[PDB]
Amino acid sequence: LQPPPQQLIVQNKTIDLPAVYQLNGGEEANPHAVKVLKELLGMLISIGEKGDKSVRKYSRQIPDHKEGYYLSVNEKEIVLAGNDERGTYYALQTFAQLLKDGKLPEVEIKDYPSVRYRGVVEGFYGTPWSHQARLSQLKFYGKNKMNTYIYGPKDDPYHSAPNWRLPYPDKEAAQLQELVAVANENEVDFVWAIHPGQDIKWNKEDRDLLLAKFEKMYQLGVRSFAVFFDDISGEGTNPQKQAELLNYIDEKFAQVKPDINQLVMCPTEYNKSWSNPNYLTTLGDKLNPSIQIMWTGDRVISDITRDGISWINERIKRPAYIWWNFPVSDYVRDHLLLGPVYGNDTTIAKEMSGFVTNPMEHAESSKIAIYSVASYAWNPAKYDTWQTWKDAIRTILPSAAEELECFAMHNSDLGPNGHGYRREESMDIQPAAERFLKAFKYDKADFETLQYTFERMKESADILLMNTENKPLIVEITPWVHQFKLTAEMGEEVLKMVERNESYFLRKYNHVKALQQQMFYIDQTSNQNPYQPGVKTATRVIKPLIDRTFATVVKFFNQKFNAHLDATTDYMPHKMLPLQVKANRVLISPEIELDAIYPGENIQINFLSAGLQKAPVKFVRFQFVLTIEK
Numbered sequence: 001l002q003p004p005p006q007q008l009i010v011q012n013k014t015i016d017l018p019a020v021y022q023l024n025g026g027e028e029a030n031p032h033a034v035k036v037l038k039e040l041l042g043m044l045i046s047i048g049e050k051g052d053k054s055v056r057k058y059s060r061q062i063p064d065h066k067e068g069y070y071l072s073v074n075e076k077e078i079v080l081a082g083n084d085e086r087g088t089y090y091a092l093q094t095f096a097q098l099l100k101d102g103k104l105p106e107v108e109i110k111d112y113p114s115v116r117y118r119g120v121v122e123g124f125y126g127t128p129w130s131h132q133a134r135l136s137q138l139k140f141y142g143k144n145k146m147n148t149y150i151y152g153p154k155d156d157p158y159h160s161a162p163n164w165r166l167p168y169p170d171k172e173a174a175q176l177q178e179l180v181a182v183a184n185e186n187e188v189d190f191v192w193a194i195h196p197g198q199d200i201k202w203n204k205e206d207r208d209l210l211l212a213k214f215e216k217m218y219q220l221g222v223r224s225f226a227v228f229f230d231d232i233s234g235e236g237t238n239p240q241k242q243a244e245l246l247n248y249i250d251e252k253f254a255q256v257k258p259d260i261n262q263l264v265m266c267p268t269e270y271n272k273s274w275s276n277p278n279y280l281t282t283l284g285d286k287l288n289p290s291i292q293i294m295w296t297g298d299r300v301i302s303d304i305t306r307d308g309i310s311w312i313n314e315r316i317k318r319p320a321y322i323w324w325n326f327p328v329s330d331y332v333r334d335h336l337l338l339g340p341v342y343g344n345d346t347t348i349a350k351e352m353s354g355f356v357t358n359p360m361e362h363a364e365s366s367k368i369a370i371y372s373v374a375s376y377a378w379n380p381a382k383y384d385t386w387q388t389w390k391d392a393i394r395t396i397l398p399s400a401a402e403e404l405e406c407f408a409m410h411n412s413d414l415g416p417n418g419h420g421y422r423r424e425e426s427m428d429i430q431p432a433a434e435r436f437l438k439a440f441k442y443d444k445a446d447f448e449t450l451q452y453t454f455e456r457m458k459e460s461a462d463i464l465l466m467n468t469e470n471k472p473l474i475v476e477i478t479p480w481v482h483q484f485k486l487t488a489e490m491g492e493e494v495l496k497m498v499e500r501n502e503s504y505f506l507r508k509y510n511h512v513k514a515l516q517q518q519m520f521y522i523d524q525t526s527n528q529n530p531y532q533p534g535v536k537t538a539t540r541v542i543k544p545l546i547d548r549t550f551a552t553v554v555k556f557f558n559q560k561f562n563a564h565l566d567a568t569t570d571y572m573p574h575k576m577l578p579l580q581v582k583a584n585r586v587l588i589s590p591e592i593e594l595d596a597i598y599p600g601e602n603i604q605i606n607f608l609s610a611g612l613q614k615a616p617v618k619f620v621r622f623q624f625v626l627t628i629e630k
């Protein structure tokens with residue numbers, strides 16, 4: 001069961017889903033839950049909300065919590081009783097996971113979430129989620145009892161700079177309208193956010209335009225709203241004016257419409273490190289208390305701790321609404337972040353108004369963290385990092401679960417980055433790895449372990465590429481899967497170099513250099529975004545072991561045979577601190593000879609620049625970056 005319920009009593013007896021049933025309360029229960037029931041489908045089945053005729057017999061069993069439910073299955077009768085309509089739907093989501101092979105376990109469940117708002121903020125920089133991916137997201141939220149979707153992609157020009165003042169065009173508006181309908185069907189609050197701050201004026205004209213935009217969104221069906229003031233400079237960062245604007249939205253709009261739910265703001269000082277030592281106490285004191293204030297923790301990317309959440313709560317005078325910056329990867333775009341969700345304290349549910357997760361631009365790939373966050377935020381006390389990661393992967397790709405686990409286990413670290421934020425990766429093999437190298441610079445078992453791992457990586461790569469159960473997932477990860485397969489091939493060849501004769505070693509060597517060039521070409525042709533282009537994989541443990549083992553066994557060959565083989569581990573056609581090639585930049589990692597003559601563009605230097613005006617260039621002699629026409 002995911003999320004695991006607050007309370008559960010299992011009897012050890014089984015019951016056939018009744019071939020013949022009597023439905024009580026289907027005309028009065030939450031239509032969204034009734035629809036799920038009738039699809040899954042004499043024995044009495046009672047569905048309803050506390051107060052309904054159908055479930056009055058169980059009124060004492062129903063948890064007195066928002067979104068709570070009582071679920072019961074026995075030989076005699078089935079009860080599916082929400083404390084409110086969402087609760088009934090959540091009872092159904094649990095019910096569907098009990099139903100296996102046409103059979104049900106005899107169980108009594110009393111359930112409710114520990115955190116009031118739980119979900120995803122699409123708030124990353126980069127390519128926003130497609131329409132299809134958002135639709136699929138919303139269904140997945142409902143299955144996993146996430147009730148919050150904060151729409152806020154940084155690069156949607158109608159969400160942020162400069163066209164936040166304009167209504168969405170017809171096509172986009174028709175799409176959002178559908179998203180809102182689908183969200184409603186899955187018991188998700190669609191929260192449309194706006195990000196006006198970089199150029200907002202504190203006047204009537206901009207105040208009114210912002211309210212007019214919210215009204216347009218409201219006409220599209222939107223019933224929750226957010227205003228983000230993060231990552232901005234200038235007058236838009238003034239706390240009094242922020243609070244005043246939010247209170248004005250609250251009082252003229254959120255409390256005037258009959259049916260507005262969440263009103264949320266993201267502060268400019270949204271993590272402890274970025275907070276000056278009185279912006280936050282001004283917000284805490286001036287902002288209407290029903291208004292939510294977001295917070296990403298001690299740092300832009302951090303895990304939430306008891307000390308950290310108590311620090312925020314005291315300044316803002318309400319429980320912080322957490323924006324958790326994982327698995328967002330818009331600052332490490334060359335990595336996928338498919339590891340487990342961990343690091344957040346599991347005893348601080350009462351200290352938070354909400355918990356949402358900023359995910360990767362890769363929507364399906366994000367379902368691993370998302371499913372885990374859902375589990376954490378509903379039942380933090382029973383949150384099991386590893387089992388939930390395994391369950392996520394198995395729900396997302398039942399046909400190739402083991403292969404996805406293999407891929408995901410070696411694609412979880414961010415690599416070095418400006419935020420200093422890291423994740424564990426490849427922990428199972430790390431001991432055999434680190435002992436194999438030390439000895440080299442070995443136990444047979446460690447060698448076979450590495451060998452087993454490479455073999456497995458290839459099996460996983462090839463089965464994943466060809467999987468048809470979740471095609472959109474496979475499209476997202478495909479470039480990394482190719483790179484992952486290459487890595488495992490390079491690993492097998494390097495191990496063969498460690499093991500017979502001069503001639504066989506040179507065959508393996510030459511095959512390695514070819515594999516290095518293949519990885520380079522995948523890195524230059526896939527995922528060519530402006531910020532961190534290319535495709536890295538297995539970066540924490542595996543690639544480093546392979547490269548170092550390669551440097552080492554070559555060194556020993558040159559010593560033994562008086563040879564002069566090149567020991568370089570990453571292919572690089574240009575010559576010169578490694579050179580890098582990023583799009584049409586050739587740069588010295590913070591005399592260069594290129595592999596051919598190109599038209600030059602510019603040379604940028606920091607210890608400065610010169611335009612080259614398309615002059616032909618092969619040699620550059622003196623950041624340190626050459627930009628060519630390519």
Ligand SMILES: O=C(N[C@H]1[C@H](Oc2ccc(F)c(F)c2)O[C@H](CO)[C@@H](O)[C@@H]1O)C(F)F
Binds near residue numbers: 300328
């Ligand atoms: O996290 C937030 N905002 C952005 C914030 O973005 C930054 C933008 C500029 C920075 F200099 C910086 F250090 C972080 O961090 C996330 C990760 O990159 C982004 O995805 C978010 O859109 C929000 F809580 F304020």
